[PDB]
Amino acid sequence: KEMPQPKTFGELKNLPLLNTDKPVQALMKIADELGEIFKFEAPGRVTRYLSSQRLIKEACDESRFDKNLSQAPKFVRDLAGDGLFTSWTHEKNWKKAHNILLPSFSQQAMKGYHAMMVDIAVQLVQKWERLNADEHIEVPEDMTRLTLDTIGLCGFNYRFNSFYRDQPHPFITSMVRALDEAMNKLRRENKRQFQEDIKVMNDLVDKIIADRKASGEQSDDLLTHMLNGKDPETGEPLDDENIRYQIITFLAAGHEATSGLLSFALYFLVKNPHELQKAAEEAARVLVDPVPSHKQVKQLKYVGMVLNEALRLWPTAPAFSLYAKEDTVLGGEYPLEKGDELMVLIPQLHRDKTVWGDDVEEFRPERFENPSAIPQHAFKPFGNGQRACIGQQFALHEATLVLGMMLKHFDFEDHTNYELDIKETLTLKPEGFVVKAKSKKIPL
Numbered sequence: 001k002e003m004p005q006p007k008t009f010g011e012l013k014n015l016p017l018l019n020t021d022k023p024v025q026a027l028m029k030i031a032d033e034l035g036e037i038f039k040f041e042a043p044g045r046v047t048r049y050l051s052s053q054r055l056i057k058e059a060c061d062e063s064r065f066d067k068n069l070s071q072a073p074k075f076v077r078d079l080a081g082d083g084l085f086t087s088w089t090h091e092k093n094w095k096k097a098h099n100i101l102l103p104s105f106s107q108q109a110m111k112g113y114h115a116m117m118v119d120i121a122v123q124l125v126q127k128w129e130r131l132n133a134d135e136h137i138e139v140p141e142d143m144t145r146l147t148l149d150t151i152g153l154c155g156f157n158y159r160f161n162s163f164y165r166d167q168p169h170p171f172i173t174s175m176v177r178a179l180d181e182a183m184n185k186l187r188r189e190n191k192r193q194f195q196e197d198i199k200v201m202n203d204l205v206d207k208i209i210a211d212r213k214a215s216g217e218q219s220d221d222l223l224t225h226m227l228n229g230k231d232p233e234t235g236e237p238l239d240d241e242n243i244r245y246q247i248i249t250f251l252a253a254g255h256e257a258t259s260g261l262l263s264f265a266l267y268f269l270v271k272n273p274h275e276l277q278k279a280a281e282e283a284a285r286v287l288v289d290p291v292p293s294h295k296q297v298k299q300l301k302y303v304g305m306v307l308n309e310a311l312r313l314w315p316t317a318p319a320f321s322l323y324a325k326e327d328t329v330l331g332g333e334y335p336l337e338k339g340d341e342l343m344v345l346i347p348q349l350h351r352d353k354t355v356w357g358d359d360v361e362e363f364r365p366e367r368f369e370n371p372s373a374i375p376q377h378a379f380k381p382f383g384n385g386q387r388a389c390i391g392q393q394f395a396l397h398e399a400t401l402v403l404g405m406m407l408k409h410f411d412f413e414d415h416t417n418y419e420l421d422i423k424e425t426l427t428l429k430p431e432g433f434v435v436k437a438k439s440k441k442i443p444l
């Protein structure tokens, strides 16, 4: 078969369709019009956007396709070097870092990060306790303070102290503006600003790395695990520059996807008072202590379904790219040559009615009551295979912990009847999402 293609702009091909503040949402509507697969061209490039489980299940075959650096990864490499998110699978550093870090990202390791995550989670609860009557919460704003701070502490025992600030730590300022300057190229002076922001970031990370080496200190952070770890295959440790790239990667790549998830989840729950009540009821039943234990977080199952359903509707890291390792036919109908690229459009996958049923636009956490009912590769918010999100257990333990506590400690009002507005950076979030809290007065 011959692939549909969206509207073209003379010599710029489909490029100007990406000249927009909301390009994922623009691609979703094209997929609505054109179906499970379309060709997208720009000067010098072509890729194909996939939307059906039928096709994505083959694109997720790792004997046939591997991770491609385009978009999210390629421009981000300018700040995260050959960290895990921005390295090709065949780069020696990717496989080294993968084998060394997998153990520090498992469910087991979350027990070691648990206390630092509760540290920051408590600051968030205390902030909201301490608002006056008539004040309100800026949700993605507070979520982003929390996830950056949690990553900083779990990653390299460094405190950005975001809940003490109107103006973020200069590193965060630099990293935010550096992701902005990366993302903005997707369509095209402050080149020396980027160079300054990179240098702010490296100098800080290399400092903490040297300081930790000089001190000999052992703590419960990822930096300790990186300075200590040896790859079983090569027998080598990571070098100091690579360790710095990983720390920046966890911050640049991990914080926003995770605050986005918390924000959408809260958005869905306030728009669906029956499901908020069910999740509040589980939080009260389970979180019986002043501060949550790791084990109690594992017990918040409904809260976990809530998060999964939020990720289904609005996967906050919304697309990833693959290349064909050899000539191959996709779907029985589309021949591809080696090197041919594909984009997996996750929010559209997650709306595949053949897989989810007809109610795909509905918020329904009970969909995830039995995960084995979901066909393979139908739900991919953490990507695929050996290149899937190393931070997934981190991200979900964090979101479950935090949502669980917010639900234990507060009732919520959508006091403005907020109209969803999805801002896109490298990630997705509900821009301007605001709520009022009313404390249940449960002491920490």
Ligand code: HEM
Binding pocket: 067, 072, 073, 084, 085, 086, 098, 249, 250, 251, 253, 254, 255, 257, 258, 261, 315, 316, 317, 319, 320, 321, 381, 382, 383, 384, 386, 387, 388, 389, 390, 391, 392, 394, 395
């Ligand atoms: C809800 C939050 C998150 C979502 C939805 C998410 C999603 C994803 C996705 C889709 C990819 C695949 C990218 C690709 O194929 O090009 C990925 C990779 C990755 N993510 Fe996340 N992520 C989240 C949180 C985090 C956190 C908290 C960390 C902290 C370390 C993190 C670190 C990474 C890294 C290092 C990779 C590359 C892994 C590899 O290729 O070896 N992520 N993530």
Ligand SMILES: NCCc1ccc(O)c(O)c1
Binding pocket: 072, 085, 253, 254, 257, 316, 317, 318, 319, 320, 389, 391, 426, 427
């Ligand atoms: N760790 C999440 C990093 C990330 C952010 C945006 C994306 O589109 C993506 O594929 C991955």
